[PDB]
Amino acid sequence: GKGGAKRHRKVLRDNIQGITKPAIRRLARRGGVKRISGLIY
């Protein structure tokens, strides 16, 4: 349970976590559906 010279570096440009979820919904409505499931996207 220590500071231990901790350095934090994780990867969120390329990797799919990093990309933006609204970026998708932005996409979803152009099609014009009313609803987005969590599972689906």
Which residues are at the interface with DNA (CB under 7 A)? 12-13, 18, 20, 25, 28, 33-40
Are 18 and 12 contacting, i.e. CB atoms less than 8 angstroms apart? yes
The smaller minimum CB distance to DNA, of residues 4 and 31, is found at 31
The smaller minimum CB distance to DNA, of residues 5 and 11, is found at 11
18: which 2 tokens? 């990093």
Gap between the Cα atoms of 39 and 41, Å rounded: 6
Residue carrying structure tokens 């609803």: 35
